[PDB]
Design a protein around this nucleic acid. Structure first.
Ligand SMILES: Nc1nc2c(ncn2[C@@H]2O[C@H](COP(=O)(O)OP(=O)(O)CP(=O)(O)O)[C@@H](O)[C@H]2O)c(=O)[nH]1
Ligand code: MET
Ligand SMILES: [Mg+2]
Ligand SMILES: [Zn+2]
Lengths: 267, 470, 143, 25
RNA sequence: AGCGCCGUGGCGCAGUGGAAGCGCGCAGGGCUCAUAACCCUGAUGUCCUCGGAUCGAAACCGAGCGGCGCUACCA
């Protein structure tokens, strides 16, 4: 069951930017629900809606799908929202869809957990999502850090530990991201012996592979040797491949041949 | 109840198989027809020449059965740049009761010493008279240096002409004249297209061909009507090859050498490189008895330019890891056959058309690179390969100072600049390296109508040698 | 596939593919303008706007996304003939009639046909609207 | 009509015939 | 021989973790005495073939098919 607004409180603040799905139009416009903040209803007057001319009303309203939203005035005493679709720009739309995805993913994971446990989903956001959004600024980034670091769940009080286990398993199953760094080096040697030099250099390159990062010097051609590594954090692969580059240059600068680089390490 | 594969294995075993070459035999007694040599290498090189879009490789695949790759997506259909290599074994059958013309049988490189007689009712076994290699030269107007290199490595020739097309095909004339330039008078004329032909049309084309070859150097060349697609008149060409073409003098007294025309990097992709091979250079030994594990150096080799602009050549020494000929890895190589010299050479060095027309010498000999060479040149009266629509085939003009000319010494495709032109000698400067071994027949081509045009022949007389940097 | 001309029947020469038209509501999208453009060393806008010049109707041009809409009911023959007028007036040079000539501006704003085989600077018909069109967008540098 | 544009068109046609003369002479 | 891309309703792009998407198409209706513009409403589909993960996978992954952009003819 979908409830327990993703953000902190029930009533949207002033000038906060949200995302609304059209639900019902009488004459004045889109008095509809929010999908980023609380699901409380809010007015959307038609003049607050259209930048172009108002030609196709039905093609424009698009009931059943989310759209941008800027809040202008809030009812904080009985509950209503003054919300608009005119105070937006494209670069604003970008962060709008960003926040849309950010809230959707956390709602999906915690809705799965609350559906499986039959534990009221508001208790899930109380016990889990809100402390993570306090520590780390957003529960999505907190889940991403949980995938690498277990410490995020310390100091936080489970409603039951099986909740922790199921959440860990599901975030590991769906939020699994490790990026491949590949480089390309031309052997341009015109010399006497390079094949044995290639043996030495590639043995040295593959021995540098760590237990968590196995660099594999694969063959795709005679000059072009390719270098692939699975960067686990995406900061050490560049220096690993730089070490391999130093190795290849140092090997071939003495036998008499020449080697040159085309593609440095890039994710 | 036996599979075809089990069968083939059985009559391969019963045929004597493919025996391994001995490690160290008596070389003073070996001939190119010893059973030790014929089973695992080709001693006669045969070239194929013809007009463009004719099907030279098709006759080769009809004779042997090994395809010529025809690679590079674009070149899968139009024309290929490198040569075409295929191996054929000339099997005669020892029973004289069967007719002579169908006695001869050409088979692939994988055939046995004595496989059964395919003619229904003959219990004889084939005896291999000789294993021969086939070089499919290009047949286009731009590719000319590779053709002339193939002719230089050719020992026998096969001219191909089509019937219903126009009689005077000038590409064929250029091929035959180039073959005449490089001292080859063993040519077999082949009429490719006979099936779509009338009885009188074939006779008229034959008369035209005979009239064509009256004033050239070659006089007594046979003509054979063969069908490339119908796969017939195969035995006739083989018996003609056996009869008319003898063995050019190539014995073991002459010093060992190599002339590389093609290069082959050995970098099988997808697998780990901890199991890798060397690099193969496709070269012909026109003279020399090369074995496994010998020192060799590529004479023109590494080409570099210094800050002053001077051309420096570093001869590429290398240890031979292996020699590949015929089908099996062989211990010692027989001159008169293309061989893949697989060496510790760099993978890039043999990648592209890089070892195309270069000269290689074993340790124990010093071929000399030259920078300026004095040539003795002779030239024809009209260019060949120019279809004049009824007007006096273009008469060739005398050479001029400071002209770029494509000079093919042996196999090297070099662009020379003219320093002096005389009545019968000339002086050439090479911005690209060339080396002089003994005589090394040369061909000359000019830029007259956009693309390259052969003009005449030449021989090296003098030259300014460049001492290699150790 | 055309031999790049209309009243010209060789077997050997430079090639052009025919152009066609699909319907939109109405305006015809022409599929084969970029390929002919590359076969004539002349940008697609020159093709489309010349077709319009000899035609006399509203047109839409968008080179980034391949939707070249020319408005009107034009059977294949009519637009292939207008493009034939293009190639004869523009693409082919004087002496040999080379189907690859570029459009070049010297220090003077003399828009000129320039060839490769004969290589002359064919005196261009600046007295046409496509001349002003081409001079508006310098070739391969403002497109 | 707009005799403005007709006069301008006549001037332009005269200009074009003059430049054709200029190339031709 | 290997890696990066893709898998349409008639076409171009897209979100691929709530299950067929819009523009442009089209059949039909609305408006106008009339046509267009416009307004609207509807019809086609096995996000490729088969599994894992999941309440559920066109979708996250995979055990492969079909096609593409490089290495480069790689004994
Ligand atoms: N009618 C006929 N066609 C043949 C015959 N042999 C080959 N062809 C056809 O020639 C066409 C091209 O063959 P191909 O071997 O690739 O030509 P090529 O000799 O390599 C080109 P180049 O002469 O420049 O080297 C093929 O389609 C083949 O069917 C033949 O005997 N008769
Ligand atoms: C074209 S490679 C040279 C021939 C050699 N026998 C191999 O195969
Ligand atoms: Mg060939
Ligand atoms: Zn011209």
């Amino acid at each position: 069951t979908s409830h327990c607004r993703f953000y902190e409180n029930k009533y949207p603040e002033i000038d906060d930017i949200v995302m609304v799905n059209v639900q019902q139009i009488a004459e004045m416009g889109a008095y509809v629900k929010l999908l980023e903040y609380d699901n409380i209803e809010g007015m959307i007057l038609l003049s607050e809606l259209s930048r172009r001319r108002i030609r196709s009303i039905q093609k424009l309203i698009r009931v059943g799908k989310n759209d941008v939203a800027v809040v202008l005035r809030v009812d904080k005493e009985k509950g209503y929202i003054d919300l608009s679709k005119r105070r937006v720009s494209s670069e604003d739309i970008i962060k709008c869809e960003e926040k849309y995805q950010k809230s959707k993913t956390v709602h999906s994971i915690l809705r799965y957990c609350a559906e499986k446990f039959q534990i009221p989903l508001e208790e899930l956001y109380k016990t889990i999502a809100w402390p993570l959004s306090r520590k780390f600024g957003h529960a999505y980034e907190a889940f991403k850090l949980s995938i690498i670091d277990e410490t995020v769940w310390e100091g936080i009080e489970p409603p039951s530990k099986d909740v922790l286990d199921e959440l860990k398993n599901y975030i590991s199953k769906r939020l699994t991201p490790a990026v491949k760094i590949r480089a390309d080096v031309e052997v341009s040697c015109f010399s006497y012996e390079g094949i044995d030099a290639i043996k030495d250099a590639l043995k040295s390159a593959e021995d540098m592979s760590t237990e968590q990062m196995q660099v594999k010097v694969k063959l795709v051609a005679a000059p072009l040797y390719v270098l692939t590594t699975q960067a686990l954090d995406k900061q050490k692969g560049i220096e690993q491949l730089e070490s391999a580059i130093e190795k290849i240059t140092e090997v071939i600068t003495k036998y008499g041949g020449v080697c040159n680089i085309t593609m440095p390490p890039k994710a | 109840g036996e599979t075809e594969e089990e069968k083939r294995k059985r009559e391969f075993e019963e045929g004597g198989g493919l025996p391994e070459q001995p490690l160290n035999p008596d070389f003073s007694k070996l001939n190119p027809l010893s059973a030790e040599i014929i089973n695992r290498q080709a001693t006669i090189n045969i070239g194929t020449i013809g007009h463009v879009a004719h099907g030279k490789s098709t006759v080769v695949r009809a004779i042997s059965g090994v395809q010529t790759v025809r690679f590079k997506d674009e070149l899968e259909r139009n024309i290929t740049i490198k040569l075409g290599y295929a191996n054929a074994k000339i099997y005669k059958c020892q029973e004289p009761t069967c007719p002579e013309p169908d006695c001869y049988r050409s088979f692939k490189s994988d055939k046995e010493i004595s496989p059964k007689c395919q003619r229904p009712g003959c219990p004889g076994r084939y005896k291999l008279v000789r294993h021969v290699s086939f070089v499919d030269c290009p047949g286009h107007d731009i590719l000319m240096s590779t053709m002339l290199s193939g002719a230089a490595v050719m020992d026998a020739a096969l001219l191909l002409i089509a019937g219903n097309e126009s009689c005077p095909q000038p590409q064929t004339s250029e091929h035959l004249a180039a073959i005449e330039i490089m001292k080859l008078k063993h040519v077999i004329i082949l009429q490719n297209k006979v099936d779509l032909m009338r009885e009188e049309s074939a006779l008229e084309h034959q008369k035209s061909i005979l009239k064509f070859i009256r004033g050239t150097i070659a006089d007594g060349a046979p003509i054979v009507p063969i069908s490339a697609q119908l796969k017939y008149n195969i035995d006739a060409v083989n018996e003609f090859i056996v009869k008319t073409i003898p063995v050019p003098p190539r014995d073991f007294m002459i010093s060992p050498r190599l002339i590389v025309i093609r290069s082959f990097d050995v970098n099988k992709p997808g697998a780990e490189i901890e199991d890798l091979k060397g690099g193969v250079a496709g070269g012909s030994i026109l003279n020399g008895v090369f074995k496994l594990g010998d020192e060799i150096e590529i004479r023109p080799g590494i080409v570099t330019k210094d800050d002053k602009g001077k051309i420096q050549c570093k001869p590429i020494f290398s240890n031979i890891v292996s020699l590949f000929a015929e089908q099996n890895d062989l211990k010692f190589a027989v001159p008169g056959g293309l061989i893949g010299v697989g060496t510790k050479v760099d993978p890039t060095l043999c990648r592209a058309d890089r070892l195309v027309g270069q000269v290689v010498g074993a340790k124990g000999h010093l071929p000399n690179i030259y920078t300026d060479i004095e040539i003795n040149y002779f030239l024809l009266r009209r260019l060949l390969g120019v279809k004049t629509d009824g007007q006096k085939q273009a008469k060739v003009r005398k050479l001029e100072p400071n002209e770029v000319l494509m000079v093919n010494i042996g196999s090297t495709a070099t662009g020379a600049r003219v320093v002096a032109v005389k009545a019968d000698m000339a002086r050439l400067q090479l911005t690209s390296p060339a080396c002089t071994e003994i005589n090394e027949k040369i061909a000359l081509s000019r830029r007259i109508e956009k693309h390259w045009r052969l003009i005449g022949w030449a021989t090296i007389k003098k030259g300014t040698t460049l001492e290699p940097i150790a | 596939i055309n031999i790049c001309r209309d009243n010209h029947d060789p077997f050997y020469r430079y090639k052009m593919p025919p152009i066609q038209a699909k319907v939109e509501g109405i305006k015809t999208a022409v599929l084969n303008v970029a390929d002919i453009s590359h076969a004539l060393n002349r940008p697609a806008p020159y093709i489309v706007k010349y077709f319009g010049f000899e035609l006399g109707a509203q047109t839409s041009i968008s080179v980034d996304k391949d939707r070249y809409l020319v408005n009107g009911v034009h059977e294949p023959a009519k637009l292939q003939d207008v493009l034939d007028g293009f190639i004869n007036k523009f693409v082919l040079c004087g002496s040999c009639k080379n189907p690859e000539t570029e459009i070049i501006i010297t220090k003077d704003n003399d828009l000129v046909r320039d060839c490769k085989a004969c290589g002359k600077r064919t005196p261009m018909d600046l007295r046409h609207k496509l001349s002003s069109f081409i001079l508006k967008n310098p070739p391969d540098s403002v497109s | 009509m707009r005799a403005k544009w007709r006069k301008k068109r006549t001037r332009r046609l005269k200009r074009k015939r003059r430049k054709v003369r200029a190339r031709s002479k």
